[PDB]
A paper describes a structure:
P-type ATPases form a large membrane protein superfamily that couples ATP hydrolysis to the transport of cargo across biological membranes. In human cells, P5B-ATPases execute the active export of physiologically important polyamines such as spermine from lysosomes to the cytosol, a function linked to a palette of disorders. Here we describe a series of cryo-electron microscopy structures of a yeast homolog of human ATP13A2-5, Ypk9, determined at resolutions reaching 3.4 Å, and depicting three separate transport cycle intermediates, including spermine-bound conformations. Ypk9 exhibits ten TM helices and a soluble N-terminal domain (NTD) in close proximity to the membrane, perhaps involved in lipid regulation.
While the E2.Pi structures are highly similar, distinctions are identified between the two recovered E2P states (see further below). Spermine uptake is accomplished through an electronegative cleft lined by transmembrane segments 2, 4 and 6. Equivalently, completion of cargo-binding is linked to the proceeding E2.Pi state, where SPM is accommodated in a cavity on the luminal side, coordinated by conserved acidic and hydrophobic residues, including the conserved VPPALP motif. As such, the composition of the cavity also allows binding of shorter physiological polyamines, e.g., SPD and putrescine, in a similar manner. Indeed, the NTD-domain is displaced between the E2P and E2.Pi structures.
Author numbering: 203 to 298, 315 to 547, 558 to 719, 745 to 798, 826 to 1019, 1034 to 1394
The structure:
């Protein structure tokens, strides 16, 4: 039958090609003997290259009734997982007669089920044997043992990750190709009487292994602790309910929502009876309390849980997974269980293998493979040269195989980590802890930097801007002063200022525990203002700098549904501040007395709602003083008559004081900034204007569905401005119709899904590049937008408060989370200080780390090539450097200079340039290759100079042991040492991205120490340093000549690195198109932006 099934996964990003290969063959025993007798074929090579393994142990089977199946994805990486066996599952609707021995796999927490009649694998779990039937069956629960029959087919609500043991992570990390080559090199060094440097590399590699092991373990702990939850639910069945843990029920079980201990909803469940009040802060990003009505039979019979999205009417009938309950206001039947739920499908995308778009740690190993390919040729040449001189076979093998180790240094990736580690230490010093170090270098190449106006660049709680008085004496509203003006104007029954100030702490339930109120944050902020808050008794503490006393009685609560609250209580005199009313300007101005209206009740409300502020109405009910008595009880509807408003109280999301400076710094540093939020567009645009994300006096355009239908694959968008409307945009080109002023386009969240689902790719890319404000965006839409940014070559980073939207933090290149160090989960970075000032710190230290990591890579490659040249110039006479000269070079000239060249802070000012991030492009390889060439030239000239001296001691070809005391060994030792120290000097970064070498001490001091030591060894070595290091007597004028060669090499290398090799790189770039004129593609966002600014805006 059919063998290979090529289907895309439900999420567009991931694709796979499931291929059902056979179990094994009789040849498995032949496989075992022939690949484990050597010990380095099966467990090493066929784990690194699975393609061949599966082409040996297996042939093919169309019939998917085998023991294990291999999985192929779009990134050419294959894993192997077996087939799980279950005895009995009779209904066909479970996968959708009788079915036996179901075949199933779980690949990256995707459950694939094989259906026998159709002979195919499916991942859709929408129907999943619903059997709801009618309401009376739904309330009956689920009798019998069928819960177990509905358990093994779908598992529990637990969404815990695959907790790999230490023995599995150990063989996953320690068994890399490199860490095998390092074991080979250490074995060679131990066999070649080279113990000290081998022990040093063993310690360094062990430290790297422990660091990576603890990093991965902490990452798994963070991922596991975030997604775990357990609670004792009360009901499974209608008959004999009893409290069981939430990791036990199956789809079809019914549980009481009104249980007192049920703080947050375990699994999504259709509401059978009663109403609920839920909080959706962490799914869909709305902290406003949401009502939930019980589901009806008609809505229950049309359930299609296959699609993650759904219509709006179904949303108000089933609960959400992992959402906090505001108050226990009810029983509900679960719809789905496990990773296939609303929160499950969003935690599954956080566990998929990342594409690893940062290719520096892959390009370094690719160039290491290239050096290994060169080292094979070097090994062959050394072998055939040593055959000519007829040396001992042990020494021939040792020298020829040691040349391979010299060319490919085992300490290159270990010294690629020291600069990153220093950057991590500096960041932890600056009170920002970063988990993944490898992302720090990615922070260098940040092109865009997203945000979130919930609590990141704005304060979390709502804040009061000012007040608006009724001004009954003069209908024109007075200017706001944000202070007390009670005695300034009379405006004498009551005063609007005193009445409003009494209202500010009247109609809300407030209480204290220690210093801070316990009430809802909407009402909490109001009392602090003017410093006349009364909580206990009646009177309060008034400031010294003649205000009437305070007092309140007959308190009530502000119902969000009816949006009204009235409190009557005498406070001063007999008819002053007696009735105080809180409400909303939506409907109560119609109820308000028309004489009180200053004819500004509507346009001011409209202007403040367009400005995104929150307006609440302050009113004074006109009731005579004759209604005061101790036993006073009046229903709300009796008091509610009248209620003319006497002012407006204004709320806003006041931005942090340093947000504007950070946004301006990022904009001036040629880094775009966007805002991704979940609240209404009216305040997101205002916050963007305040911060500087949208330029001042720049029009903001939103798309609307007016020109077409609503949704569902057929609509025509009209892009209209916020201020000064009827300035449309072309839906096909996104240009300002003149029927370069900054476009500042602000899409919404539902429209963004419309455009992603069905719109021209040019239109999507134009909006995506032009986008500045993204409001009403769920975290799923947040990560979709982040992936779209990565899809148009933006290397964007995310900067979000808390860890609710951690999917966007993990999907982005840099995931800075402004939360506590222990409260942060699934985020590469974590900042204790809650300002957004940490983004310049992260970007700046990332740029410094990127530059110093490229410098360390170039220095390590130069060290490898210099040693290869200085040993290949000596292998022509069966000689090499000494056992201690190699030690000195490898331990006191490359490791100290590397770890002290990687020790410098970043330049304080964020420059407008961007460091090079490609390890293959001509701006990196050409200076490195030219440095290799000039090092080879200087060493060759030193060798030629020493070969013509009268006191020359020629090397002697020896068989048993290679002689070291020859006059062309000392020259190639000292010239090599100078070419190491001065290359470390030259390749060190300077002003544009890191601290200047003059401004930092422990690099200049290290260079001075390692250069003075070598100079004293060259000029005046003691007697104990001759026989120890195997030097040879040299002329004093020749020592001066060696110093001159070192200085000339320093001059030429510095002039090349700064003034000449960049010109050579530009020359190769200019002559690139003479061979293949096709212009290498730039970033997609750069192309779209330049085309849009030039061609589409120069056709007026």
């Amino acid at each position: 039958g059919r063998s290979s099934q090529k289907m895309r996964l439900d999420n567009d990003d991931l694709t796979i090609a499931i291929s059902g290969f056979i179990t094994n063959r009789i040849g498995f025993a032949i496989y075992i003997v022939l690949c484990v007798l050597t010990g380095g074929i099966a467990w090493l090579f066929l784990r690194w290259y699975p393609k061949y393994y599966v082409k040996l142990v297996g042939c093919a089977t169309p019939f998917r009734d085998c023991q294990w199946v291999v999985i192929e994805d779009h990134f050419n990486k294959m894993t192997i997982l077996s087939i799980r066996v279950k005895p009995y599952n009779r209904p066909l609707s479970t996968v959708f007669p009788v079915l036996r021995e179901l075949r199933s796999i779980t690949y990256c927490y995707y459950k694939f089920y094989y259906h026998p009649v159709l002979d195919k694998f499916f991942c859709c779990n929408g129907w999943k044997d619903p059997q709801w039937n009618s309401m009376q069956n739904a309330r009956s629960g689920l009798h019998g043992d069928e819960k177990a029959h509905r358990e093994a087919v779908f598992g529990p609500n637990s969404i815990d990750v695959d907790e790999q043991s230490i023995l599995q992570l150990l063989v996953s990390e320690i068994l890399t190709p490199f860490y095998a080559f390092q074991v080979f090199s250490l074995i060679l060094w131990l066999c070649d009487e080279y113990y000290y440097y081998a022990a040093a590399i063993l310690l360094i590699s062990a430290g790297s292994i422990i660091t990576s092991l603890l990093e991965t373990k902490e990452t798994r702990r963070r991922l596991r602790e975030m997604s775990r939850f357990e609670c004792e639910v009360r009901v499974f069945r209608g008959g004999f309910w009893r409290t069981f843990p939430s990791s036990d029920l199956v789809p079809g079980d019914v549980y009481e929502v009104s249980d007192p201990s049920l703080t947050q909803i375990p699994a999504d469940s259709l509401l059978l009876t009663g109403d609920c009040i839920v909080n959706e802060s962490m799914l869909t990003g709305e902290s406003v309390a949401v009502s939930k009505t019980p589901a009806t039979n008609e809505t229950l019979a049309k359930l299609n849980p296959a699609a993650s999205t759904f219509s709006h009417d179904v949303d108000k009938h089933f609960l959400y997974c992992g959402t906090k309950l505001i108050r226990a206001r009810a029983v509900a039947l679960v719809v789905r269980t496990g990773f296939n739920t609303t929160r499950g499908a969003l935690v599954r995308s956080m566990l998929v293998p990342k594409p690893s778009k940062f290719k520096f740690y892959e390009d370094s190993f690719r160039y290491l493979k290239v050096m290994g390919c060169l080292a094979g040729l070097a090994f062959i040449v050394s072998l055939v040269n040593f055959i000519r001189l007829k040396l001992h076979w042990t020494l021939i093998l040792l020298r020829a195989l040691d040349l391979l180790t010299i060319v490919v240094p085992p300490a290159l990736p270990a010294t690629l980590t020291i600069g990153t580690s220093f950057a991590v230490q500096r960041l932890k010093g600056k009170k920002i802890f970063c988990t993944s170090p490898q992302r720090v270098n990615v922070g260098g190449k940040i092109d865009l930097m997203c945000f979130d106006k919930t609590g990141t660049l704005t304060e979390e709680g709502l804040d009061v801007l000012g007040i608006r008085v009724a001004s009954r004496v003069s209908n024109r509203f007075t200017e706001l002063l944000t202070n007390v003006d009670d005695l300034t104007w009379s405006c004498k029954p009551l005063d609007p200022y005193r009445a409003a100030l009494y209202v500010m702490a009247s109609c809300h339930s407030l209480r204290i525990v220690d210093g801070v109120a316990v009430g809802d944050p909407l009402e909490v902020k109001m009392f602090e203002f003017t410093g006349w808050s009364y909580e206990e008794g009646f009177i309060a503490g008034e400031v010294i700098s003649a205000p009437p006393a305070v007092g309140v009685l007959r308190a009530f609560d502000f119902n969000p549904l009816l949006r009204r609250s009235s409190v009557i209580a005498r406070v001063v005199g007999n008819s002053g501040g007696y009735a105080l009313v809180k409400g909303s300007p939506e409907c109560m101005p119609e109820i308000c007395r028309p004489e009180t209206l200053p004819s500004d009740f509507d346009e001011l409300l409209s202007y403040y709602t367009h400005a995104g502020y929150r307006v609440i109405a302050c009113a004074t009910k006109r009731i005579p003083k004759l209604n005061l008595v101790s036993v006073n009880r009046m229903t709300r509807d009796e008091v509610e008559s009248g209620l003319d408003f006497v002012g407006f109280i204004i709320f806003e999301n006041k931005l942090k004081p340093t947000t504007t400076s950070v946004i301006k710094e990022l904009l001036s540093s040629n880094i775009g900034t966007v805002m991704i939020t979940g609240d209404n567009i009216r305040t997101a645009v205002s916050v963007a204007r305040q911060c500087g994300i949208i330029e001042e006096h720049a029009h903001c355009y939103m798309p609307r569905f007016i020109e077409g239908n609503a949704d569902d694959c057929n609509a025509k968008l009209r892009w209209e401005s916020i201020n000064n409307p009827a300035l449309e945009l072309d839906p096909w080109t996104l240009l300002p119709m003149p029927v370069i002023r900054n476009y500042a386009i602000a899409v919404t969240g539902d429209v963004f899904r419309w455009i992603v689902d069905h719109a021209p790719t040019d239109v999507l890319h134009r909006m995506l590049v032009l986008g500045k404000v993204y409001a009403r965006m769920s975290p799923d839409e947040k990560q979709e937008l982040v992936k779209k940014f990565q899809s148009i070559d933006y290397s964007c980073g995310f900067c979000g408060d808390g860890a609710n939207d951690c999917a966007a933090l993990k999907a982005a290149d840099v995931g800075i989370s402004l939360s506590e160090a222990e409260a942060s989960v699934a985020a590469p970075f974590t900042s204790q200080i809650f300002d957004i000032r940490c983004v310049p710190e992260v970007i700046r230290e990332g740029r410094a780390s990127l530059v110093t990591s490229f410098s360390c890579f170039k220095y390590m490659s130069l060290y490898s090539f210099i040693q290869f040249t200085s040993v290949s110039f000596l292998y022509v006479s069966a000689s090499n450097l000494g056992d201690f000269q190699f030690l000195y070079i490898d331990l006191m000239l490359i490791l100290p200079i590397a770890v002290f060249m990687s020790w410098a802070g970043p330049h304080s000012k964020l420059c407008a340039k961007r460091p090079v991030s490609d390890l293959v492009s001509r701006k990196v390889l050409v200076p490195l290759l030219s440095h290799v060439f000039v090092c080879v030239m200087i060493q060759a000239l030193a060798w030629v100079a020493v070969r013509q001296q009268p006191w020359y001691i020629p090397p002697i070809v020896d068989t048993e042991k290679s002689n070291i005391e020859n006059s062309e060994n000392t020259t190639l030792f000292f010239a090599s040492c100078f070419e190491y120290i001065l290359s470390g000097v030259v390749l060190n970064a300077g002003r544009p991205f890191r601290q200047s070498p003059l401004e930092t001490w422990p690099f200049l001091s290290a260079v001075a120490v390692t250069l003075i030591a070598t100079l004293l060894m060259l000029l005046v070595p003691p007697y104990w340093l001759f026989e120890f290091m195997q030097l040879t007597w040299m002329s004093w004028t020749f020592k001066i000549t060696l110093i001159a060669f070192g200085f000339v090499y320093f001059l030429i290398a510095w002039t090349g690195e700064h003034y000449l090799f960049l010109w050579l790189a530009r020359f190769l770039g200019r002559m690139r198109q003479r061979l293949f004129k096709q212009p290498k593609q730039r970033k997609l966002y750069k192309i779209v932006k330049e085309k849009l600014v030039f061609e589409n805006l120069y056709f007026q």
